[PDB]
Amino acid sequence: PTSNDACLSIVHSLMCHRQGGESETFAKRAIESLVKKLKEKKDELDSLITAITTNGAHPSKCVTIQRTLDGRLQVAGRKGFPHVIYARLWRWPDLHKNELKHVKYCQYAFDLKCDSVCVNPYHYERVVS
Amino acid sequence: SNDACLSIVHSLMCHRQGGESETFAKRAIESLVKKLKEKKDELDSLITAITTNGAHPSKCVTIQRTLDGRLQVAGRKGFPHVIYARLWRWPDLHKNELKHVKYCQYAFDLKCDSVCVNPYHYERV
DNA sequence: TGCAGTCTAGACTGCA
DNA sequence: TGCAGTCTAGACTGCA
Ligand SMILES: [Zn+2]
Ligand SMILES: [Zn+2]
């Protein structure tokens, strides 16, 4: 288990839930990137931890980072879309860009283009094609 | 025009003292040249300077100065005047080992908006 | 802090 | 034009 302690511990806990969609190092970076950002919103950090560790056993609040102008998030030099990146890490290893729709109760879903963007993977659904 | 800048880049490559890798050098030179395609006077100044290994003293060759004065090239952080001095004169140059000419208007240590990179406006110490 | 190195949004580039 | 990648000034981090 892990609450709001050292990022390293947290990063590790979360790493153990990855699906191996990408390399050890990418996931580590992506997750460290996200934990750091979330240390400013420890309510949302906790929400992320509980969602991931319970595999969505319960409903979770949104987990948000700031929208970039073009929507993209860069992680270790690679360019992607944030919601997709983290959904690939924690639910669907072979996910594709336009492959997911959001949950009717996600207030900060990516497609909504709010100042914020939800990255909580249990707030999206895989819709192929 | 375009082919012009490339012609200049590769020429300046011939005078590189192998201080850094080939690619790094090209990247650093490509960057400098692009910044100068407007001040085509300072450009020619730079050109004649390097090719003659310091025969005819020329105009300051300046660029816009950053916030911390550093200039990144192919990932590496460094100081402008140094980077380019190390590239054409002293391959093992060190940060502190560089004093500027007393007629150089836009010398680095002068904290002006522009920074002269013409290496022959600096001398090693 | 100051210094030296890492990361990434925004700016930019090239290919289709 | 749109997309997917490259680059780096500025933000940050760690060490002393
Ligand atoms: Zn949400
Ligand atoms: Zn000068």
mmCIF file of C-alpha atoms (C1' of nucleotides) and ligand atoms in Angstrom:
data_model
loop_
_atom_site.group_PDB
_atom_site.id
_atom_site.type_symbol
_atom_site.label_atom_id
_atom_site.label_comp_id
_atom_site.label_asym_id
_atom_site.label_seq_id
_atom_site.Cartn_x
_atom_site.Cartn_y
_atom_site.Cartn_z
ATOM 1 C CA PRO A 1 0.000 0.000 0.000
ATOM 2 C CA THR A 2 1.039 3.642 -0.427
ATOM 3 C CA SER A 3 -0.380 7.069 0.381
ATOM 4 C CA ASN A 4 1.334 10.441 -0.028
ATOM 5 C CA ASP A 5 4.914 9.537 0.898
ATOM 6 C CA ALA A 6 8.138 9.755 -1.119
ATOM 7 C CA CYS A 7 7.598 10.002 -4.877
ATOM 8 C CA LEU A 8 10.030 7.127 -5.371
ATOM 9 C CA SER A 9 7.947 4.751 -3.258
ATOM 10 C CA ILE A 10 4.813 5.914 -5.040
ATOM 11 C CA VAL A 11 6.371 5.744 -8.485
ATOM 12 C CA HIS A 12 7.372 2.201 -7.643
ATOM 13 C CA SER A 13 3.991 1.085 -6.360
ATOM 14 C CA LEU A 14 2.414 2.414 -9.543
ATOM 15 C CA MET A 15 5.093 0.891 -11.756
ATOM 16 C CA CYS A 16 4.052 -2.532 -10.495
ATOM 17 C CA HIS A 17 0.666 -1.965 -12.104
ATOM 18 C CA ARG A 18 2.024 -1.188 -15.565
ATOM 19 C CA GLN A 19 1.106 -3.560 -18.375
ATOM 20 C CA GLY A 20 4.474 -3.437 -20.141
ATOM 21 C CA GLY A 21 3.122 -1.466 -23.087
ATOM 22 C CA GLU A 22 6.469 0.288 -23.240
ATOM 23 C CA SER A 23 9.937 0.099 -21.740
ATOM 24 C CA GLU A 24 10.802 0.180 -18.040
ATOM 25 C CA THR A 25 12.333 3.627 -18.454
ATOM 26 C CA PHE A 26 9.488 5.246 -20.380
ATOM 27 C CA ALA A 27 6.840 4.188 -17.854
ATOM 28 C CA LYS A 28 9.071 5.321 -14.997
ATOM 29 C CA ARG A 29 9.467 8.725 -16.593
ATOM 30 C CA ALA A 30 5.806 9.063 -17.520
ATOM 31 C CA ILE A 31 4.793 8.137 -13.985
ATOM 32 C CA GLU A 32 7.385 10.324 -12.251
ATOM 33 C CA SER A 33 6.264 13.145 -14.499
ATOM 34 C CA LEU A 34 2.709 12.628 -13.282
ATOM 35 C CA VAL A 35 3.396 12.069 -9.601
ATOM 36 C CA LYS A 36 5.422 15.283 -9.381
ATOM 37 C CA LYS A 37 2.601 17.280 -10.983
ATOM 38 C CA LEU A 38 0.109 15.638 -8.610
ATOM 39 C CA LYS A 39 2.052 16.458 -5.469
ATOM 40 C CA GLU A 40 0.458 19.878 -5.864
ATOM 41 C CA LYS A 41 -2.974 18.233 -5.720
ATOM 42 C CA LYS A 42 -2.557 15.485 -3.123
ATOM 43 C CA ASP A 43 -6.303 14.835 -3.137
ATOM 44 C CA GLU A 44 -5.982 13.843 -6.779
ATOM 45 C CA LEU A 45 -2.745 11.967 -6.200
ATOM 46 C CA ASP A 46 -4.559 9.834 -3.613
ATOM 47 C CA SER A 47 -7.439 9.349 -6.050
ATOM 48 C CA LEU A 48 -4.977 8.115 -8.671
ATOM 49 C CA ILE A 49 -3.330 5.710 -6.266
ATOM 50 C CA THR A 50 -6.619 4.190 -5.107
ATOM 51 C CA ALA A 51 -7.999 3.850 -8.639
ATOM 52 C CA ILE A 52 -4.899 2.104 -9.975
ATOM 53 C CA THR A 53 -4.374 -0.162 -6.960
ATOM 54 C CA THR A 54 -8.014 -1.210 -6.833
ATOM 55 C CA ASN A 55 -8.272 -1.584 -10.593
ATOM 56 C CA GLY A 56 -11.390 0.577 -10.523
ATOM 57 C CA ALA A 57 -13.159 -1.411 -7.828
ATOM 58 C CA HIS A 58 -14.794 1.867 -6.855
ATOM 59 C CA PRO A 59 -15.740 5.129 -8.587
ATOM 60 C CA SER A 60 -12.975 7.724 -8.578
ATOM 61 C CA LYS A 61 -12.750 11.485 -8.858
ATOM 62 C CA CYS A 62 -10.976 12.960 -11.886
ATOM 63 C CA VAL A 63 -7.182 13.152 -11.927
ATOM 64 C CA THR A 64 -6.040 16.146 -13.885
ATOM 65 C CA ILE A 65 -3.020 17.911 -15.343
ATOM 66 C CA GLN A 66 -2.891 21.153 -17.325
ATOM 67 C CA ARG A 67 -3.874 21.022 -20.984
ATOM 68 C CA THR A 68 -1.064 21.975 -23.352
ATOM 69 C CA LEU A 69 -1.976 24.129 -26.351
ATOM 70 C CA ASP A 70 -1.781 21.298 -28.887
ATOM 71 C CA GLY A 71 -3.056 18.768 -26.371
ATOM 72 C CA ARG A 72 0.080 16.642 -26.476
ATOM 73 C CA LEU A 73 2.282 15.471 -23.609
ATOM 74 C CA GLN A 74 5.969 14.845 -24.125
ATOM 75 C CA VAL A 75 7.570 12.105 -22.070
ATOM 76 C CA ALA A 76 11.251 11.279 -22.424
ATOM 77 C CA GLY A 77 11.316 13.031 -25.795
ATOM 78 C CA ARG A 78 8.349 11.094 -27.159
ATOM 79 C CA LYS A 79 5.178 12.989 -28.129
ATOM 80 C CA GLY A 80 1.768 11.593 -27.246
ATOM 81 C CA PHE A 81 -1.672 12.393 -25.892
ATOM 82 C CA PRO A 82 -1.860 12.381 -22.070
ATOM 83 C CA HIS A 83 -5.059 10.421 -21.441
ATOM 84 C CA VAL A 84 -3.908 7.808 -23.946
ATOM 85 C CA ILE A 85 -0.396 7.531 -22.563
ATOM 86 C CA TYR A 86 -1.586 6.655 -19.057
ATOM 87 C CA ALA A 87 -4.420 4.439 -20.229
ATOM 88 C CA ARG A 88 -1.840 2.510 -22.211
ATOM 89 C CA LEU A 89 0.320 2.125 -19.108
ATOM 90 C CA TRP A 90 -2.376 0.932 -16.741
ATOM 91 C CA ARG A 91 -5.138 -0.741 -18.743
ATOM 92 C CA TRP A 92 -4.468 -1.309 -22.440
ATOM 93 C CA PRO A 93 -0.850 -1.901 -23.592
ATOM 94 C CA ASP A 94 -1.652 -1.730 -27.314
ATOM 95 C CA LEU A 95 -3.908 1.328 -27.212
ATOM 96 C CA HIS A 96 -4.173 3.754 -30.144
ATOM 97 C CA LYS A 97 -4.640 7.529 -30.370
ATOM 98 C CA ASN A 98 -8.297 7.739 -31.386
ATOM 99 C CA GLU A 99 -9.267 4.523 -29.638
ATOM 100 C CA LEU A 100 -10.857 5.794 -26.418
ATOM 101 C CA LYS A 101 -14.038 7.618 -25.410
ATOM 102 C CA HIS A 102 -14.608 9.152 -21.983
ATOM 103 C CA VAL A 103 -17.068 8.333 -19.196
ATOM 104 C CA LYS A 104 -20.271 10.402 -19.005
ATOM 105 C CA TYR A 105 -19.278 11.621 -15.529
ATOM 106 C CA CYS A 106 -15.694 12.732 -16.344
ATOM 107 C CA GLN A 107 -15.825 16.505 -16.098
ATOM 108 C CA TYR A 108 -12.352 17.115 -17.514
ATOM 109 C CA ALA A 109 -12.228 14.569 -20.319
ATOM 110 C CA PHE A 110 -9.630 15.188 -23.007
ATOM 111 C CA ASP A 111 -12.134 15.744 -25.811
ATOM 112 C CA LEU A 112 -13.823 18.442 -23.730
ATOM 113 C CA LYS A 113 -10.762 20.678 -24.047
ATOM 114 C CA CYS A 114 -11.005 22.246 -20.610
ATOM 115 C CA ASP A 115 -8.042 24.118 -19.169
ATOM 116 C CA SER A 116 -7.475 20.840 -17.342
ATOM 117 C CA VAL A 117 -7.398 17.287 -18.657
ATOM 118 C CA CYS A 118 -8.269 14.088 -16.855
ATOM 119 C CA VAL A 119 -5.772 11.240 -17.145
ATOM 120 C CA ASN A 120 -7.550 8.759 -14.835
ATOM 121 C CA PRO A 121 -7.684 5.618 -17.043
ATOM 122 C CA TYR A 122 -10.903 4.407 -15.426
ATOM 123 C CA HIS A 123 -12.649 7.531 -16.702
ATOM 124 C CA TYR A 124 -12.230 6.317 -20.265
ATOM 125 C CA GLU A 125 -13.489 3.340 -22.259
ATOM 126 C CA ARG A 126 -11.741 1.553 -25.108
ATOM 127 C CA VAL A 127 -13.667 2.170 -28.319
ATOM 128 C CA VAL A 128 -11.699 0.595 -31.167
ATOM 129 C CA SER A 129 -11.752 2.212 -34.637
ATOM 130 C CA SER B 1 19.475 31.895 -50.182
ATOM 131 C CA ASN B 2 19.111 28.390 -48.742
ATOM 132 C CA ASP B 3 21.898 26.712 -50.721
ATOM 133 C CA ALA B 4 23.857 29.774 -49.626
ATOM 134 C CA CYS B 5 23.613 29.022 -45.909
ATOM 135 C CA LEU B 6 24.561 25.390 -46.486
ATOM 136 C CA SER B 7 27.570 26.419 -48.550
ATOM 137 C CA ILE B 8 28.702 28.597 -45.649
ATOM 138 C CA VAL B 9 28.074 25.977 -42.958
ATOM 139 C CA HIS B 10 30.177 23.258 -44.548
ATOM 140 C CA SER B 11 32.970 25.686 -45.365
ATOM 141 C CA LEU B 12 33.179 26.691 -41.712
ATOM 142 C CA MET B 13 33.228 22.976 -40.907
ATOM 143 C CA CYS B 14 36.627 22.673 -42.606
ATOM 144 C CA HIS B 15 38.106 25.060 -40.058
ATOM 145 C CA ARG B 16 36.736 23.196 -37.060
ATOM 146 C CA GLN B 17 39.596 22.011 -34.858
ATOM 147 C CA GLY B 18 37.825 18.728 -34.178
ATOM 148 C CA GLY B 19 37.127 19.973 -30.665
ATOM 149 C CA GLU B 20 33.747 18.248 -30.710
ATOM 150 C CA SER B 21 31.996 15.543 -32.714
ATOM 151 C CA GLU B 22 31.207 16.143 -36.379
ATOM 152 C CA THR B 23 27.442 16.258 -35.873
ATOM 153 C CA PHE B 24 27.628 18.525 -32.818
ATOM 154 C CA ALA B 25 29.787 20.928 -34.800
ATOM 155 C CA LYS B 26 27.346 21.036 -37.709
ATOM 156 C CA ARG B 27 24.406 21.604 -35.375
ATOM 157 C CA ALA B 28 26.222 24.423 -33.591
ATOM 158 C CA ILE B 29 27.240 26.035 -36.881
ATOM 159 C CA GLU B 30 23.824 25.593 -38.501
ATOM 160 C CA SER B 31 22.331 27.327 -35.477
ATOM 161 C CA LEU B 32 24.737 30.275 -35.631
ATOM 162 C CA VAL B 33 24.326 30.793 -39.375
ATOM 163 C CA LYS B 34 20.531 30.738 -39.250
ATOM 164 C CA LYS B 35 20.582 33.466 -36.597
ATOM 165 C CA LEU B 36 22.658 35.652 -38.928
ATOM 166 C CA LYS B 37 20.966 35.428 -42.335
ATOM 167 C CA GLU B 38 19.540 38.875 -41.575
ATOM 168 C CA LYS B 39 22.734 40.666 -40.565
ATOM 169 C CA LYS B 40 24.472 39.673 -43.786
ATOM 170 C CA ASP B 41 27.251 42.084 -42.857
ATOM 171 C CA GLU B 42 28.107 40.376 -39.578
ATOM 172 C CA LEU B 43 27.786 37.070 -41.436
ATOM 173 C CA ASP B 44 30.476 37.928 -43.989
ATOM 174 C CA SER B 45 32.497 39.287 -41.068
ATOM 175 C CA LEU B 46 32.294 35.942 -39.305
ATOM 176 C CA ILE B 47 33.135 34.151 -42.538
ATOM 177 C CA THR B 48 36.322 36.014 -43.431
ATOM 178 C CA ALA B 49 37.429 35.866 -39.790
ATOM 179 C CA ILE B 50 37.408 32.084 -39.376
ATOM 180 C CA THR B 51 38.677 31.139 -42.846
ATOM 181 C CA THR B 52 41.807 33.259 -42.455
ATOM 182 C CA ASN B 53 42.418 32.076 -38.901
ATOM 183 C CA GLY B 54 42.418 35.701 -37.744
ATOM 184 C CA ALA B 55 44.009 37.779 -40.503
ATOM 185 C CA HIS B 56 41.642 40.728 -40.928
ATOM 186 C CA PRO B 57 39.888 42.059 -37.792
ATOM 187 C CA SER B 58 36.135 42.195 -38.497
ATOM 188 C CA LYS B 59 32.828 43.410 -37.037
ATOM 189 C CA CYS B 60 31.269 41.910 -33.937
ATOM 190 C CA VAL B 61 29.261 38.814 -34.791
ATOM 191 C CA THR B 62 26.441 38.844 -32.260
ATOM 192 C CA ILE B 63 23.306 36.891 -31.313
ATOM 193 C CA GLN B 64 20.359 37.394 -28.966
ATOM 194 C CA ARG B 65 21.391 36.723 -25.369
ATOM 195 C CA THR B 66 19.338 34.306 -23.247
ATOM 196 C CA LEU B 67 18.304 34.563 -19.596
ATOM 197 C CA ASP B 68 21.211 32.619 -18.124
ATOM 198 C CA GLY B 69 23.514 33.407 -21.033
ATOM 199 C CA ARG B 70 23.814 29.734 -21.900
ATOM 200 C CA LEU B 71 23.243 28.192 -25.331
ATOM 201 C CA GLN B 72 22.089 24.631 -25.807
ATOM 202 C CA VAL B 73 23.341 22.674 -28.821
ATOM 203 C CA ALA B 74 22.435 19.050 -29.527
ATOM 204 C CA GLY B 75 21.438 18.724 -25.876
ATOM 205 C CA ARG B 76 24.603 20.093 -24.298
ATOM 206 C CA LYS B 77 24.493 23.366 -22.369
ATOM 207 C CA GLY B 78 27.387 25.765 -22.798
ATOM 208 C CA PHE B 79 28.401 29.386 -23.178
ATOM 209 C CA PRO B 80 28.064 30.922 -26.673
ATOM 210 C CA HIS B 81 31.413 32.649 -27.106
ATOM 211 C CA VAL B 82 33.125 29.619 -25.582
ATOM 212 C CA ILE B 83 31.291 27.015 -27.668
ATOM 213 C CA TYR B 84 32.346 28.713 -30.893
ATOM 214 C CA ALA B 85 35.857 29.527 -29.703
ATOM 215 C CA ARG B 86 36.326 25.890 -28.725
ATOM 216 C CA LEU B 87 35.123 24.927 -32.182
ATOM 217 C CA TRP B 88 37.626 26.909 -34.245
ATOM 218 C CA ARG B 89 40.579 27.752 -31.996
ATOM 219 C CA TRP B 90 40.857 25.824 -28.716
ATOM 220 C CA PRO B 91 39.359 22.283 -28.677
ATOM 221 C CA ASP B 92 40.157 21.797 -24.975
ATOM 222 C CA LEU B 93 39.131 25.297 -23.914
ATOM 223 C CA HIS B 94 37.755 25.801 -20.399
ATOM 224 C CA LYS B 95 34.971 28.114 -19.231
ATOM 225 C CA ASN B 96 37.042 30.595 -17.203
ATOM 226 C CA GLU B 97 40.004 30.644 -19.586
ATOM 227 C CA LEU B 98 38.825 33.464 -21.872
ATOM 228 C CA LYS B 99 39.352 37.259 -21.915
ATOM 229 C CA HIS B 100 37.704 39.563 -24.460
ATOM 230 C CA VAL B 101 39.258 42.050 -26.861
ATOM 231 C CA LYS B 102 39.050 45.697 -25.800
ATOM 232 C CA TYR B 103 37.558 46.865 -29.108
ATOM 233 C CA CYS B 104 34.815 44.220 -29.145
ATOM 234 C CA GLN B 105 31.600 46.203 -28.693
ATOM 235 C CA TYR B 106 29.182 43.426 -27.747
ATOM 236 C CA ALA B 107 31.538 41.265 -25.672
ATOM 237 C CA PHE B 108 30.052 38.580 -23.441
ATOM 238 C CA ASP B 109 31.120 40.121 -20.124
ATOM 239 C CA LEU B 110 29.281 43.292 -21.170
ATOM 240 C CA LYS B 111 25.817 41.906 -20.380
ATOM 241 C CA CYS B 112 24.250 43.574 -23.419
ATOM 242 C CA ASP B 113 21.147 42.299 -25.228
ATOM 243 C CA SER B 114 23.446 40.999 -27.952
ATOM 244 C CA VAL B 115 26.523 38.830 -27.479
ATOM 245 C CA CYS B 116 29.498 38.751 -29.817
ATOM 246 C CA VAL B 117 30.531 35.254 -30.808
ATOM 247 C CA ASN B 118 33.267 36.219 -33.242
ATOM 248 C CA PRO B 119 36.020 34.182 -31.554
ATOM 249 C CA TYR B 120 38.747 36.586 -32.642
ATOM 250 C CA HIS B 121 37.123 39.136 -30.327
ATOM 251 C CA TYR B 122 38.346 36.991 -27.442
ATOM 252 C CA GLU B 123 41.747 35.721 -26.278
ATOM 253 C CA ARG B 124 42.688 32.738 -24.084
ATOM 254 C CA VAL B 125 44.120 32.998 -20.552
ATOM 255 C "C1'" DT C 1 22.855 30.219 -3.602
ATOM 256 C "C1'" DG C 2 25.484 29.058 -7.882
ATOM 257 C "C1'" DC C 3 26.607 25.859 -10.988
ATOM 258 C "C1'" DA C 4 26.066 22.223 -14.223
ATOM 259 C "C1'" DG C 5 22.908 18.888 -16.164
ATOM 260 C "C1'" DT C 6 17.918 17.050 -17.276
ATOM 261 C "C1'" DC C 7 13.149 17.618 -19.043
ATOM 262 C "C1'" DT C 8 9.481 19.368 -21.861
ATOM 263 C "C1'" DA C 9 6.026 22.995 -23.999
ATOM 264 C "C1'" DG C 10 6.215 25.612 -27.548
ATOM 265 C "C1'" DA C 11 8.317 26.559 -31.931
ATOM 266 C "C1'" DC C 12 9.783 24.778 -35.558
ATOM 267 C "C1'" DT C 13 10.710 21.238 -39.627
ATOM 268 C "C1'" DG C 14 9.810 17.703 -43.235
ATOM 269 C "C1'" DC C 15 7.503 14.296 -45.383
ATOM 270 C "C1'" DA C 16 2.997 12.575 -47.246
ATOM 271 C "C1'" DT D 1 -2.556 21.425 -44.570
ATOM 272 C "C1'" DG D 2 -1.992 17.702 -41.209
ATOM 273 C "C1'" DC D 3 0.657 14.822 -38.760
ATOM 274 C "C1'" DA D 4 4.722 13.087 -36.178
ATOM 275 C "C1'" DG D 5 8.974 14.021 -35.241
ATOM 276 C "C1'" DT D 6 13.248 17.421 -33.814
ATOM 277 C "C1'" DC D 7 15.116 21.229 -31.089
ATOM 278 C "C1'" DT D 8 16.075 24.283 -27.287
ATOM 279 C "C1'" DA D 9 15.066 28.567 -23.804
ATOM 280 C "C1'" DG D 10 13.277 28.277 -19.861
ATOM 281 C "C1'" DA D 11 11.988 25.627 -15.785
ATOM 282 C "C1'" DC D 12 13.693 22.730 -12.872
ATOM 283 C "C1'" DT D 13 16.881 19.527 -9.910
ATOM 284 C "C1'" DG D 14 20.918 17.756 -7.438
ATOM 285 C "C1'" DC D 15 25.123 18.718 -5.428
ATOM 286 C "C1'" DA D 16 28.386 21.660 -2.661
HETATM 287 ZN ZN ZN E 1 -11.986 12.333 -15.216
HETATM 288 ZN ZN ZN E 2 33.281 41.229 -30.824
#
